[PDB]
Amino acid sequence: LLDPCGYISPESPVVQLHSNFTAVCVLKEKCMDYFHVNANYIVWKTNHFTIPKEQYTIINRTASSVTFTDIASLNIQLTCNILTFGQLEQNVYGITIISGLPPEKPKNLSCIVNEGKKMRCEWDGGRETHLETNFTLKSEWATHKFADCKAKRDTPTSCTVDYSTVYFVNIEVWVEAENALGKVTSDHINFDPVYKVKPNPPHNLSVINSEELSSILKLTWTNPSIKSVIILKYNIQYRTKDASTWSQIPPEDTASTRSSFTVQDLKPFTEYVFRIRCMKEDGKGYWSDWSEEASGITYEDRPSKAPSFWYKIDPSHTQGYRTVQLVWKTLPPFEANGKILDYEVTLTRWKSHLQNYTVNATKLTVNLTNDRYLATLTVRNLVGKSDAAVLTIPACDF
Amino acid sequence: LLDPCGYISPESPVVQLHSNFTAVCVLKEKCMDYFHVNANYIVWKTNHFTIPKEQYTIINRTASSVTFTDIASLNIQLTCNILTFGQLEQNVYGITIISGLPPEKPKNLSCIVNEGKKMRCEWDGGRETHLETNFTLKSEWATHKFADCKAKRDTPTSCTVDYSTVYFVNIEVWVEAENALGKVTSDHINFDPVYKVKPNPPHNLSVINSEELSSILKLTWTNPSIKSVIILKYNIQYRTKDASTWSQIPPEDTASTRSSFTVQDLKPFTEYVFRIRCMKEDGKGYWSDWSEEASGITYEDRPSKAPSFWYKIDPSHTQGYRTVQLVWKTLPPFEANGKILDYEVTLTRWKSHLQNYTVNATKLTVNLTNDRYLATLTVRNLVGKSDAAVLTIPACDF
Amino acid sequence: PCPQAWGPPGVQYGQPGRSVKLCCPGVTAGDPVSWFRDGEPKLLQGPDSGLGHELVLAQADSTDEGTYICQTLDGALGGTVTLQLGYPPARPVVSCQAADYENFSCTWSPSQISGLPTRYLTSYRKKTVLGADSQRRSPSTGPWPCPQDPLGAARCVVHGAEFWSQYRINVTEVNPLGASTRLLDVSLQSILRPDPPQGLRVESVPGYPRRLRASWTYPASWPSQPHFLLKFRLQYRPAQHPAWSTVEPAGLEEVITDAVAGLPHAVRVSARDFLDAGTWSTWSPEAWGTPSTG
Amino acid sequence: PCPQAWGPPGVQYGQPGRSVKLCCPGVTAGDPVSWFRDGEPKLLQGPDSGLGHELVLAQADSTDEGTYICQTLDGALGGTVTLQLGYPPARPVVSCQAADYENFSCTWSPSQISGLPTRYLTSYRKKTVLGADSQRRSPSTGPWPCPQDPLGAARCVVHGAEFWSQYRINVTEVNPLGASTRLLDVSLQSILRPDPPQGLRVESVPGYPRRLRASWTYPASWPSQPHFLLKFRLQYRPAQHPAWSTVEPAGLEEVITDAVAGLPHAVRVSARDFLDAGTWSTWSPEAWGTPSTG
Amino acid sequence: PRAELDSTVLLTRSLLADTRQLAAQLRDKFPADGDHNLDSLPTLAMSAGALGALQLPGVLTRLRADLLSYLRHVQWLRRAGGSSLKTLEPELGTLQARLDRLLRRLQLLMSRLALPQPPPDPPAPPLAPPSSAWGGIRAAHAILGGLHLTLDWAVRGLLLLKTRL
Amino acid sequence: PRAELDSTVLLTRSLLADTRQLAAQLRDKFPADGDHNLDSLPTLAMSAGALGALQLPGVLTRLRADLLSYLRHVQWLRRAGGSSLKTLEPELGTLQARLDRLLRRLQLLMSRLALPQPPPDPPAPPLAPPSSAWGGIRAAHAILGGLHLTLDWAVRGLLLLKTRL
Ligand SMILES: *[C@@H]1O[C@H](CO)[C@@H](O[C@@H]2O[C@H](CO)[C@@H](O[C@@H]3O[C@H](CO)[C@@H](O)[C@H](O)[C@@H]3O)[C@H](O)[C@H]2NC(C)=O)[C@H](O)[C@H]1NC(C)=O
Ligand SMILES: *[C@@H]1O[C@H](CO)[C@@H](O[C@@H]2O[C@H](CO)[C@@H](O[C@@H]3O[C@H](CO)[C@@H](O)[C@H](O)[C@@H]3O)[C@H](O)[C@H]2NC(C)=O)[C@H](O)[C@H]1NC(C)=O
Ligand SMILES: *[C@@H]1O[C@H](CO)[C@@H](O[C@@H]2O[C@H](CO)[C@@H](O)[C@H](O)[C@H]2NC(C)=O)[C@H](O)[C@H]1NC(C)=O
Ligand SMILES: *[C@@H]1O[C@H](CO)[C@@H](O[C@@H]2O[C@H](CO)[C@@H](O)[C@H](O)[C@H]2NC(C)=O)[C@H](O)[C@H]1NC(C)=O
Ligand SMILES: *[C@@H]1O[C@H](CO)[C@@H](O)[C@H](O)[C@H]1NC(C)=O
Ligand SMILES: *[C@@H]1O[C@H](CO)[C@@H](O)[C@H](O)[C@H]1NC(C)=O
Ligand SMILES: *[C@@H]1O[C@H](CO)[C@@H](O)[C@H](O)[C@H]1NC(C)=O
Ligand SMILES: *[C@@H]1O[C@H](CO)[C@@H](O)[C@H](O)[C@H]1NC(C)=O
């Protein structure tokens, strides 16, 4: 009576969905004698649901069996019971039926060596299997097997080896997927780790001007340590502080290792932000992230044309004089070519000595006589003065 | 000649900042004989910086020593050298001097038992010490010591024990801070873990109306499993879908375990969002997070007063008739008391049979005779019709 | 020498379609005797030559139901037997309950009456765990009678029952032809269900327009004792509303705090052992109350 | 029997403030002799009674510099000695360099001349690692002479030097009174510095307004060999700009790609062993070029 | 009464609730049908007829012997148990950490109440490991099912003590 | 030439750069002043006078013997080394994983080039652990300093082979 009598076979099977499974319950002689029962008295239950009597098959007087077809439940819990003394169910044995599909051959397998970190590989898993599936990254030379890489529970589609990367030697790598229902290996790939490096982006980026011209800014940065193994290539992008999209330098112009670069054809007095990325000259691998942004300002330069210039005139409060209000408009930024420092106005009477007035405003009230004057206006920055706007203001009797 | 000759003492000392430290370099007899030198020829260097000759002190012909005062550098690297054959420095021995402060007694130590998780304790660390300092949570009964809890490198101010929480038994807990420069223990605290539980917030929150009245909404939710050990208390907050701040039910009204609550005094046809939190009735511990938000809508009810009602009148195109344009304004939401389903207009001529017209708009064109009419307007929802607005429109000769 | 009777001393019983073997009561074993059906003179025959001490019927059909007369070939009336037809008993249906920690009780009804004098044998035993055999009876865990007090009520009574042990009750329906024993596993700690509280009253609480006080007492069949308290679950519902609200009061009182102002409320409560033993009681009679105004 | 002379055969040397002990050259040891200062008749005395074979001077001051005459008491002129005053040698200052993988060279200057015939002994040895003593010389790692070709040039020459071994060069300045040996550790792999490239030329590249081609050759003192290449570092700078830009060209050519259009550019380059041995060369002569227009 | 006696009854009720929930969840997941037995558990020969009458050492002594047997069996499940029952953690381990803790606390209780301590009894030899995973599942039902009776009477026994001390 | 010969010289240059950087960083952090020695390293008795002349087995044989000694010493630092040098990881471990890998690859190189293999020489007995942390630091300088010479001549030796095969 004591200890679980009889057994269920197979012990703990795993089968594929839509396949067939036959379960056999066999009773030990001692239990069969004691309760005065046999296979015909065995009833099967799964997850508290009674299996319909029409599905049983007595294989022998000692054992009963059932056959499930087109299995569609992921976790059939099977229990075998006897109806003993009658109208009483007692547990004989039990088993858990797990179902699923075998793992698919991993495809689109790829690896990457981030400078300073060990090799990391990624692969595409196939159909969900609902079972605990182990992933092991395998790698071996024709004369040597490397330490297995066991994927983490959280990241079953990626693994990170425990050995440091060794460049310039071909390594054979592949991933092996295996679970209780089947074993399969992905296709083997062959490559030199040097072609799967993902360097860090350049750092210590600094933008420095040049007090010569206004259309050049010098970029400086510190290359990543990985330059000792591969030759770096770069991509320099630039835009105006207000632009919405980035432009790009022709790749051919930045196709080899360097630690500085001079950008030309920049707009005057415009602030620019720069960002860079780098990789091996041959393009084999994946692009690194963008570097930190850097800002800079161009040098001074002078206005490219004279400003628009006009005036208004009214009678003065002083007999014999006229009050002339000179007015002008602030140059557009692209024409101003920089911070306006101040203005200079000149006034010359026909055949008389020139007078000059520096003005920090867009209007000036002066007391003029009734004679004809020539008026000019230039604007000055650190580099020099603009050409003058010149007008003849005729005499009042004209 | 071979193997490091002589030694530096003390082997690898750790001292407190602003304290004094004396270092002694002693030369082995074999080295002293070979190079024909002695203590007076010993020069001391630290981190590539030459120690000024005036700071040496010859303790004996075999050993030289230096004394540093008011030590302010965190990691003096000390090396002892001989000037041998002359104008040549050779390494004798070396030591690393580390400095800092002893750990302060941890204060404001507190623990929390999140339901389903093990006990977690937090404490305030003191002045930075710049040295690797271990934190170990200690706990013991008067007759038994519990497993030590080792703080994690990332979280040195918190530790999470490895044993499951056992409520209703007082446990003595404290944290011990120790490092190379000193050992100290925080003050001991005593408490029953049952008073440091932080239950999860209620889930499965559902808002259900009641088709009786319009000012009641019934709240339902599933209490957290922790209700088996402590009695829960709640805080119910509510506001209108457009309100910016939350209101709150009087705590006294929700001071004991429950799985439902009926909110009263709600505005008609207003959408309300609810959120709840719970804790032990006595207030000993820390408040849990807010539950998930829940939305609901009140039942229908009818307008509380008649709408404003007026009209415009113009000559009709049919001889003998007048075109009367009745117009009204949509009730304010707080007065509408719900979705307007439709309107009903009635027209009664003095001593004649009433006519009624259902209108789904805010204007109606009708052809009336030249007699006097009484016009009424009611608005109807699922519950009923409003009181009517009544006007006398006088005859055209009035 | 024939099987002693079942009920009355000169009547025997049988089932249709089976075989029934009648004997002549008052005749020396070995005397040849004749059998007749009442009112019909044809001499019946039998496999044993045709003249033994016992009549046999392989027929057993409805036409065979009636009164029979046996007589010796001399003409002497050897006795009378009545054949009543029926069917074996069906398995009875058994349920148990218990409102205290000492006694529990079970009841049963026939699933079929058969038309036969269906009397009942009732017993129960305490199952053990050693399980060498069905014989571990030094305290004698065997069959114990369930006495039927006025010999009806259809219920076993257990006095001095073990609170935590598990019992397998053996109710056997018997008629003169067999048994169909009902076995029902019962543990006092699982099956227990107290009666609902009595005297539930609801009262307003002046000053608080949304609180009501409910009070009630223990059921009389449950003696108040410090070892087994009861937990309680109270439900309340405003008139015309469809869904109950549930609270779990401590003790014999409960202040409801979310009652809708000015509306009748229905209230009902049920009881269970405070350590979640057995199952919850049936709901109490509904009680109504109305919160104070203001 | 007196110390054989240093330079010329009848002159001896001394340092001021020290003790100097003159001997009479042409007199039998044991004959008493008299000493006089040139032009001054006073008979000088000495600790050895006052009449020995050797004059002693504890004075040694500047007034003692001049020509001395010794004569026996008979009047016979026994010889002449000249006292020249000076100072012990100072420690010399030594530097080495090497532009090839075979030979390296060191030079030295006196830190003090003293006024004495300061000749130099030069040697070097190959340090080992067993270090039982300074005697492991079966291949004889001892002192090897640095021959001075026209017996000047102030430089040792090493032929057939070990490329990777470390050497401790022993330069000893000597005068008639002592030594002050300079020891300088030198490893060919650490000290090496090639000469700059020659013939640096910059040319425009038609069609590309912002590319220039730089070319150069190896230094003549560096034979081109597949075992030790050189890496190169090129610098360019627009006129009036303060900061150099650096690139590291492969081979003897480099296309500059960020030259400012229409502006003169300065260019200079330096060389180092391709396996980062030794140190970078000095900068080349500046070369100028101008990008094409368009 | 006393605070130490109040606390022990409260923790048993907590553990009783934990045991009932895990026992019902387990049979819910692995529906064993029929009465399962193990030779090593004690027979709980107590009719609750009269329980006040019993004296103080016996109530505490019986709980200690029963709980020690249950503790070994809980530990036995964790060590040699079949993989089928890994789904019962961490709930099974918290019960282990709680029942062991309460048994230890009871020994402390006995010292403070000056009750005679039982003589060190000879521990029962080790239980053979289960012959299969399902044998382990049946064993899990016996321990949790058997436990939720011992603890029920533990609450009761401590409550009897509470009415006096 | 051959691709296998190109690859080995390239990896040595990579390892040489790694060794130089770690050696300069280490002396930068622990400024040992003076020439440090260990009895177990080989004397690199090669003047680079004439190196083409030497035949193929000897160049490869000398590298293998020297590199095997350096490998043991690198391993020796990791196992019994003092805590003072924990700051040199993971840089020291990558070098270990790289130098060991290159030495193994060279044995494969020898098979493919059909060079006579040396007889299995008797391995040197274990080095005693350092007597102190600073003795370990001096030992670290010798291995990295000694290595950045062996590797320099390794690049050179492989380049000599490259001009022919
Ligand atoms: C439940 O109770 C019924 C009756 O109370 C039990 O039925 C009895 O079972 C026994 C053995 O299985 C039958 O055999 C009898 O044994 C006695 C003693 O040896 C013998 O003197 C009789 O002549 C007969 O052979 C018995 O006929 C039967 N019915 C009765 C006693 O009315 C039944 O076994 C019980 N079920 C359990 C305990 O599971
Ligand atoms: C660097 O070179 C100088 C000279 O080339 C070395 O100086 C010489 O050192 C020796 C021993 O230290 C002195 O002693 C001499 O030994 C010989 C042989 O026994 C003996 O015949 C002499 O009478 C004298 O005692 C020697 O005076 C001295 N100067 C010389 C030779 O001019 C110096 O030791 C070397 N330093 C090294 C190798 O570190
Ligand atoms: C009745 O038939 C069953 C068929 O399943 C027999 O069970 C098998 O018996 C063989 C005998 O060697 C074993 O090898 C198998 O392992 C058994 N099946 C299983 C699933 O274990 C059974 O033995 C037969 N009855 C008798 C008395 O032999
Ligand atoms: C010269 O004095 C020094 C003082 O530091 C002596 O060094 C100590 O010698 C004692 C002798 O037993 C040791 O116990 C100490 O451990 C030594 N100091 C240290 C720091 O180790 C030294 O011994 C003296 N010289 C001689 C020849 O005795
Ligand atoms: C077994 O599988 C076959 C297909 O291979 C299917 O046709 C059949 O229905 C399944 N069940 C049986 C044979 O009981
Ligand atoms: C999968 O990995 C787990 C953990 O290492 C292991 O227990 C299990 O047996 C593995 N499954 C198979 C099929 O090997
Ligand atoms: C040592 O410490 C004292 C203070 O305790 C200080 O005054 C002194 O300057 C320090 N240095 C010495 C004594 O060399
Ligand atoms: C601090 O912990 C680390 C890691 O366990 C240990 O190596 C170190 O010795 C500890 N420090 C002290 C002072 O015990």
Residue numbers in the entry:
A (entry chain D), B (entry chain A): 2 to 399
C (entry chain C), D (entry chain F): 3 to 296
E (entry chain B), F (entry chain E): 14 to 178
Question: Paper's wording?
Answer:
Interleukin (IL-), an IL-6 family cytokine, has pivotal roles in autoimmune diseases, fibrotic complications, and solid cancers. IL-11 activates downstream signalling pathways by binding its two cell surface receptors: the IL-11 specific receptor, IL-11Rα, and the signal-transducing receptor, glycoprotein (gp)13013,26. Following the formation of the receptor complex, the Janus kinase (JAK)/signal transducer and activator of stat (STAT) and extracellular signal regulated kinase (ERK)/mitogen-activated protein kinase (MAPK) pathways are primarily activated. IL-11 and IL-6 utilise a homodimer of gp13026,34,35 while other IL-6 family members exploit a heterodimer of gp130 with a second signal-transducing receptor, such as LIF receptor (LIFR), OSM receptor (OSMR), IL-27R/WSX-1 or IL-12 receptor β−2 subunit (IL-12Rβ2).
To understand the molecular mechanisms underpinning human IL-11 signalling complex formation, we solved three structures of the complex containing either the cytokine binding domains of gp130 (gp130D1-D3) or the complete extracellular domains of gp130 (gp130EC) using electron cryo-microscopy (cryo-EM) and X-ray crystallography. We obtained a 3.5 Å resolution cryo-EM reconstruction of the IL-11Δ10/IL-11RαD1-D3/gp130D1-D3 complex (referred to as the gp130D1-D3 complex), and a 3.8 Å resolution cryo-EM reconstruction of the IL-11Δ10/IL-11RαD1-D3/gp130EC complex (referred to as the gp130EC complex). D1 of IL-11Rα was not visible in the gp130D1-D3 complex map and was poorly defined in the gp130EC complex map, suggesting this domain is flexible. D5-D6 of gp130 were poorly defined in the gp130EC complex density and were not included in the deposited model. We considered the possibility that structural dynamics of gp130 D4-D6 contributed to the decreasing density quality with distance from the cytokine binding regions. Histograms of the distributions along each trajectory are unimodal, indicating continuous motion. This analysis shows that the D4-D6 region of gp130 is dynamic and is not stabilised upon complex formation. A multistate model, allowing flexibility of gp130 domains D4-D6 and IL-11Rα D1, fit the SAXS data for the gp130EC complex better than our single consensus model of the complex, further supporting flexibility of these domains within the complex. The affinity of the IL-11RαD1-D3/IL-11Δ10 binary complex for gp130EC, (KD 4 ± 2 nM, ΔH -20 ± 1 kJ/mol; Fig. 2Iiii) is very similar to the affinity for gp130D1-D3, indicating that the membrane-proximal (D4-D6) domains of gp130 do not contribute substantially to complex formation. The observation that D4-D6 of gp130 are flexible with respect to the membrane distal domains (D1-D3) provides information on the potential relative positions of the two D6 domains within the complex that may affect positioning of the transmembrane and cytoplasmic domains.
